[model samples]
Target chain A: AECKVTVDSTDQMSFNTKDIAIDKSCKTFTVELTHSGSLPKNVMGHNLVISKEADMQPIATDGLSAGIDKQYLKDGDARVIAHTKVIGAGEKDSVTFDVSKLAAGEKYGFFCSFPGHISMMKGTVTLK
Target chain B: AECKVTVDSTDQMSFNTKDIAIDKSCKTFTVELTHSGSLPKNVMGHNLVISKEADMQPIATDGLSAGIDKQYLKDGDARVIAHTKVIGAGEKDSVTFDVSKLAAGEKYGFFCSFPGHISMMKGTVTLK
Candidate 1:
């Protein structure tokens, strides 16, 4: 699982890092998200959604109506390269996607899609 | 509404208060639960379940199997007088119940039913 990377979300409404690096050497990349604080999903749910930086807002906006059962993401959304299920404090989730889906020189964004959470729970995803 | 009370949950796996008071003059009481931390529900989710002191453990155990979608509460469980949906950091939920559900002089308990959270997130509920 050397191709795996981890991210941590906290009760302070923030992620541990603002940038996520994906190694180009890996055919597939696995992202594991951990919640380091104690709060439930309905209140402060977090998920990692990957998309083009330009699409992040629209996707997040649509996700608000998708409800938590769908991890605040639209069903079969083509713009999402990958995403993990929403989780709360002390829980973790992992997702894997093909590295080829990412293009060099294009900006990628990753964020939590929970309603009103995207403002604080987002970061950049870069190819290394 | 003066009949309303509020409780706060945080990333530390504790509620801000260990005791809740329900005024006897109120016919219906409302409880608002706020999560002050940033973690999501699946990790450190919290809910407020009101029941007889003795029933708290069994209800919490059953709530776990009920899953997050049910807010960690059993469907139509008669023992529960009232409960708020599970919440994460920065989220808030409320539940209102008849004051008649509580009996004078009988000990009542309130707690978060998230799996493994009951141990630290419980408190006494009293009629005043």
Candidate 2:
């Protein structure tokens, strides 16, 4: 079975998948990020950030200040379990993390940290 | 009299000014472009192009192939009277042209030639 999940981001400020399932048997889980719109990265860039559900807002806030050059993410932020680089339309990126990082029954969230995208580009990350 | 006009483009795919007037007595006229949205240039870039109403679509069509680096305009396209560099939210550009370019009784138009923006970003340019 594929231990990877792909999420598509669009110019409309949304992600194609609302929830992601990671197989608990897999040693590592990979998340592939793709953008299907035509906008450039600077304009509608999207990135996937995984963190505890409660850290979503604070991390996104700091990521906004990090600017586009940093992919809207703080450098070496400990709160982020994994993240894909910010990308524009027709671009793709991927991130892999140890499956052990996710604890059973813990509320984990995945979201785009780009300014103004957290509200629309977030989803739940559940272990299956 | 103000010899210049200001146009504002937004993430909503629109321009703030619907019509631009240039006084006949002025030797030259200026167009100032501003983007009020927060998106970056690559995704929601906007530029102003001035041409004969009949040439708007054709110029815009060719401009799409010119790519974003050229502000979505064919370089030195004779049909264009004036144009501004494409910009994103919080960015601005301006263009100035000789008043002689506009003739009496001629139908002139101003528009954003960025891909997919022509329909919503066009307006009439008149001489007063």
Candidate 3:
């Protein structure tokens, strides 16, 4: 089952929630994010990326050079579990990942790899 | 007096809320954002930058090379009114600005300046 939908972001440099729970019963999970502002993408775009906790810093640091075409993500990064395309004002995007890919007790985090935004746009994920 | 304090961001490249309201009574307002996912900053990151509606594209495009040290913002850029530092997972940041800086009829928007993040991390600011 595909579980989870609708995520909102704003120009105030904030996300609407702090916790995202994944249901173990669902074989696949889906995440939808929306940018509800008038600003264009270059100035304030957003996207979601999932990876192991240990890989977080390295991924974000390296992703900085990846640029926007790569969605600020390192190309062919093994540490990345899943990710979505960047979106801008009045735009939205989603990503679906197989639940089996997640291992219990393995620390995971979600964030935007758009250069500097990672410092604030991050969160945790757990299979429960 | 400080007016607002809570905003949410996620690993799925989304924000929890679409619209943000500004109170005119408050001479200055603050925005605090939390990344709820377990992901790290490199793979995913976010920030908030407020600017004139028409200046959004140029700001974000130019901010790309500003690097994280600059918080993805162009140093001494005239278009920017206020901004927060880039943040990562389990990390948060905020910005407070004078309300009078905003023109009631002029257009304005908010967004993350982290390279590719502007695509989906933008919103409008209205003085109510």
Candidate 4:
């Protein structure tokens, strides 16, 4: 039951929940992202990016420099384990990653790398 | 005669023109902004903001923090001469300002304060 989780983003620049748990027993874990606000993706785009807590800031910075064509994310960067496409109002996307990639003790974080939204739209990914 | 100009924004995170000229003879000037790409206002939300060249970065930062609900702009800030609403594809917005506010030798700039798009989506506003 913990293999998948859905997080909702809003135009106000926040996520519905802050902690996402991934079951170690599952071979892969899925993260689903949704933007329930009325704003379009350019104004309030939302995406879920998974990386080490240490790498989240840099990855977000790198993605901020790139245009939306790249979905506001680094291309082929090893620091990122998985990511969903940037989405707008009422839209949704999902990303699935191997559970083995996450070490039991290491910390992981999930955040939206959409420009300024990162200031309010990130959370911790718990490995259970 | 050059009292009005039309600027186009695309999903590529760029403006169609780099320079906007306003005729000093005119009492007022208008800037019409349109998003021609398929992206929604949330992802590629574009707006035309006119301000002193020195103030562009500060205004952009303030707007970035203000979020899109406020049209990515600070409220009642005098530094902003004029700005159109954040818009999406096939949508347009316009803003008009008094030409007398611009001095002949002073440098003015126009940019989209949509999060990280300030770099490529900004240009000079010439008072002619």
lDDT of 1 by residue, B1-128 (tens): 36998999987888999988888888999999999867777566688999999999888767644667888788999899999998988889999999998977789989988755677789998788
lDDT of model 4 at position A26: 90
lDDT score, candidate 4, position A117: 68
TM-score of 1: 0.54
Per-residue lDDT of B33-99 in model 4, one digit per residue for the tens?
8888687776668899999999998898777546687888989878998899999899999988899
Task: Compose the digit string of candidate 3's lDDT tens values, residues A41-109.
Answer: 666678878888788778888787677789888899999998888777899888988888988878888
- Give per-residue CA lDDT, model 2, range A25-99, as digits (tens): 899999999999687776567999999999998898777557768877889899999999999899999999998
TM per model?
0.54, 0.56, 0.54, 0.59
Q: State the lDDT of candidate 1 residue by residue for A34-124, as single tens digits.
A: 9876677765668899999999988987775677799888899999999999999889999999999998879998988875567678889
Interface RMSD, candidates in the order listed: 9.9, 11.2, 6.2, 7.1
Best by lDDT: 2
Q: What is the docking quality class of candidate 1?
A: incorrect
Arrange candidates by DockQ, highest first: which order? Answer: 3, 4, 1, 2
Return the TM-score for candidate 3, rounded to 2 decimals.
0.54
**Interface quality of candidate 2 as DockQ:** 0.05
- lDDT of candidate 3 at residue A52, scale 0 to 100: 89
Residue pair clashes in candidate 2:
A40-B42, A40-B43, A43-B40
Off by over 4 Å in 2: B1-12, B16-128
Choose 1 or 4, whichever is better by DockQ: 4
Most TM-score-accurate candidate: 4
Query: How does each model score on lDDT?
Result: 0.84, 0.85, 0.78, 0.84
Interface RMSD of 2: 11.2
**What ranges in model 3 sit over 4 Å off?**
B1-128
